[PDB]
Specification:
Layout: E1 14-16, E2 28-33, E3 37-41, E4 44-45, E5 50-52, E6 65-68, E7 80-84, E8 96-101, E9 106-109, E10 114-117, E11 123-125, E12 134-137, E13 154-155, E14 164-169, E15 173-178, E16 182-185, H1 187-190, E17 200-204, E18 215-224, E19 239-243, E20 272-277, E21 291-298, H2 300-306, E22 321-324, E23 341-346, E24 351-361, E25 371-375, H3 380-387
Antiparallel strand pairs: 1-2, 2-5, 3-4, 3-6, 7-8, 8-10, 9-12, 10-11, 13-21, 14-15, 14-17, 15-16, 16-19, 17-18, 18-19, 20-21, 20-23, 21-22, 22-25, 23-24, 24-25
Domain Sushi: 3-68, 69-137
Subcellular location: Secreted
Disulfide bonds: 5-53, 33-66, 71-117, 101-135, 139-257, 303-323, 334-365
């Protein structure tokens, strides 16, 4: 009582493993699909398929499909767009799509935006990446002419300092936007709200600190340099604030660039940096409008020694700080707001980068009393290490 089962005809884009002239009781056959095609019984992908001829006249399992792998509609790229290369709406095995970032305010990182639909069902970059690319904000753009110092306080125009950030709530301080979801500031400015990031009301995009027209952001987490000690000097006075959401990048909101290896070239003694603020840490009155001042780097040895004459503490100025200031810029001109960025012009790239963070300094605006700033370049690995975990 051993008879044949209907000769197995493979589905399109599939084949039968053991090709026998006839199949009878107990015998078997499997179906394997071409590369880029998958076994489907209905809408269910199978690990594999193997039908066995029973005592009946029929096979125990019906023929499955060998259907092309579909990577599905490509995800939306934030601050970017997608283009179908192979053809409109085509998302199956070996189809090609091409991501692009918005033209002037974003640049593409992580790869060139080209993804192919692979056999595993994932859109895959040339580097083998199965995640979306990232549209990073272009940094260091400004509306200013140059570093053409026009002595003393000046009024900021729209787009002059698009990285400028105002930090309200528990503290009153400043910062600078990095990328579209980080804010660089001084540790002394936000140390007390280290265990309470929510209480940091973060605002940007506005020249006027009292304007109802600003862009709002909220801190997710605050990262104090572990080397900063609150009740013992300003060494390692640097902190990062993570924003809960990314901010829109336009003419009024653009991050400052981080200083690259060769940034020391443009921050030598007598090189000109710019500090901006409302006067949050000076005295008397706050400015309604954003102000700035062009100030030269002061010889470190001259500044070290200036802050050692009596009555003063020693070890005040460390290798983790730089000094800048004018030798006679009354009131209007001074250090800046606590946490604010001291910026410089990379002349090769025409991009502004942050070189200092307003940290501390004398009360008497400045001669012989310069501002002291956290030397940002010493902390690049510290900054890179935190921003890479997010």
């Amino acid at each position: 009582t051993a008879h044949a089962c209907p000769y197995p005809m493979a589905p399109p884009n599939g084949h039968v493993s053991p090709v026998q002239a006839k199949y009878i009781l107990k015998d078997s056959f499997s179906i394997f699909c071409e590369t880029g095609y998958e076994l489907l019984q209905g809408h269910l992908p199978l690990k594999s398929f193997t039908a066995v001829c029973q005592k009946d006249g029929s096979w125990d399992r019906p023929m499955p499909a060998c259907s092309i792998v579909d990577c599905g509609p490509p995800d939306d790229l934030p601050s970017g767009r997608v283009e179908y290369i192979t053809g409109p709406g085509v998302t199956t095995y070996k189809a090609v799509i091409q991501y692009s970032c918005e033209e002037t305010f974003y640049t593409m990182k992580v790869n060139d935006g080209k993804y192919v639909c692979e056999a595993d069902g994932f859109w895959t970059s040339s580097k083998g990446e199965k995640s979306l690319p990232v549209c990073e904000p272009v940094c260091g753009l400004s509306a200013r002419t140059t570093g053409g110092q026009i002595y003393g306080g000046q009024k900021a125009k729209p787009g002059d300092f698009p990285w400028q950030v105002l930090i309200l709530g528990g503290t009153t301080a400043a910062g600078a936007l990095l990328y579209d979801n980080w804010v660089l500031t001084a540790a002394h400015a936000v140390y007390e709200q280290k265990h309470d990031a929510s209480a940091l009301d973060i605002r940007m995009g506005t020249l006027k600190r009292l304007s109802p027209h600003y862009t709002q952001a909220w801190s997710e987490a605050v990262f104090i340099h572990e080397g900063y000690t609150h009740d013992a000097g300003f060494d390692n006075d640097i902190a990062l604030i993570k924003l809960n959401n990314k901010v829109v990048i336009n003419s009024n909101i653009t991050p400052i660039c981080l200083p690259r290896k060769e940034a020391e070239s443009f921050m030598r003694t007598d090189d000109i940096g710019t500090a901006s603020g409302w006067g949050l840490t000076q005295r008397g009155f706050l400015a309604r409008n954003l102000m700035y001042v062009d100030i030269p780097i002061v010889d470190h040895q001259k500044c070290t020694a200036a802050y050692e004459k009596p009555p003063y503490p020693r070890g005040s100025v460390t290798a983790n700080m730089l000094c800048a200031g004018l030798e006679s810029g009354g009131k209007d001109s001074c250090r800046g707001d606590s946490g604010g960025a001291l910026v410089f012009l990379d002349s090769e790239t025409e991009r502004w980068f942050v070189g200092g963070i307003v940290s501390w300094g004398s009360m008497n605006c400045e001669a012989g009393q310069y501002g002291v700033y956290t030397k940002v370049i010493n902390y690049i690995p510290w900054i890179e290490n935190i921003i890479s975990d997010f």
